[PDB]
Design a protein around this ligand. Structure first.
Ligand SMILES: Nc1ccn([C@@H]2O[C@H](COP(=O)(O)O)[C@@H](O)[C@H]2O)c(=O)n1
Lengths: 130, 130
């Protein structure tokens, strides 16, 4: 309540965070999220994207980023109910030259199914666990 | 040991049933096999005026038919149906559905074929799915 400068980004978000938090309105900072306006094309880049992809990005028609959230009260089996058949997903993405990037919420990395599929497709050409 | 565990209880229950006015006492399958023997001996010795009958049934044979107009929420919780299951075919038997019907409603469960521990969080997720 005395030392927290909270970063709001819009009037709606400012009102929301004022509702849900115990911050001081006179300590609010209005601006951009740095993580949304620093790593641009000509921005900062601490790593080359190509060292993480199975192939150069040019060899992919579309780069797809699957980024779900954690479901409250469940972890084991969520990913499986969202992506039950990774084999057919790989087939489809291959036939389409699509790179499917599994980037689940950190809390979800403990789903045994997640580890199973991450090991099963660690060297996959079209399914990449980030 | 078994007398001290059963006979005082059935003596109490018979006296209390008479005191409350019950005319017929039904002992239910399995548990009632020994209890009804005890109760009959007590009633004979004491000349108690009450009839005893034996009825066959179990949680299995009675819970499902009891779903008259709704499937109880208990069915999908910790003391419900999807409990203590230690294999995929155990899930099949707990679901009431045939294997093919189960996989046809919930294809994701195909990924649980070769698992051998369907307890814990996985059971809770399966309950939420059903
Ligand atoms: N699949 C996901 C889900 C969340 N996140 C991170 O977590 C933050 C908060 O997301 P949640 O609202 O899902 O918790 C995101 O803004 C992002 O930084 C992620 O990096 N990958």
């Amino acid at each position: 309540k005395n030392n927290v400068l909270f970063l709001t980004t819009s009037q709606a978000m400012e009102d929301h965070f004022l509702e849900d938090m115990a911050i001081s309105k006179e300590l609010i900072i209005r601006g951009k999220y740095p993580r949304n306006a620093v790593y641009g094309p000509n921005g900062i880049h601490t790593y080359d994207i190509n060292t993480l992809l199975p192939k150069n990005k040019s060899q992919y028609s579309q780069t797809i980023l699957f980024c779900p959230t954690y479901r409250i009260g469940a972890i084991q089996g969520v990913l499986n109910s969202l992506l039950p058949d990774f084999a057919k997903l790989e087939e489809v993405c291959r036939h389409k030259n699509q790179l499917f990037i599994v980037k689940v919420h950190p809390f979800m990395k403990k789903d045994n199914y997640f580890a199973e599929m991450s090991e099963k497709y660690k060297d996959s050409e079209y399914i990449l666990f980030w | 040991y078994v007398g001290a565990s059963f006979v005082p209880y059935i003596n109490w229950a018979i006296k209390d049933a008479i005191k409350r006015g019950y005319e017929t006492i039904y002992f239910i399958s399995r548990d009632g096999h020994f209890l009804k023997q005890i109760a009959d001996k007590i009633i004979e010795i004491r000349g108690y005026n009450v009839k005893t009958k034996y009825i066959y049934g179990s949680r299995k044979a009675w819970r499902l038919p009891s779903f008259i107009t709704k499937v109880d929420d208990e069915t999908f919780w910790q003391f419900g149906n999807f409990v203590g299951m230690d294999s995929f075919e155990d899930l099949v038997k707990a679901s009431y559905l045939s294997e093919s019907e189960l996989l046809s409603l919930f294809p994701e469960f195909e990924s649980l074929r070769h698992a051998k521990h369907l307890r814990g969080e996985i059971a809770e997720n399966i309950r939420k799915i059903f």
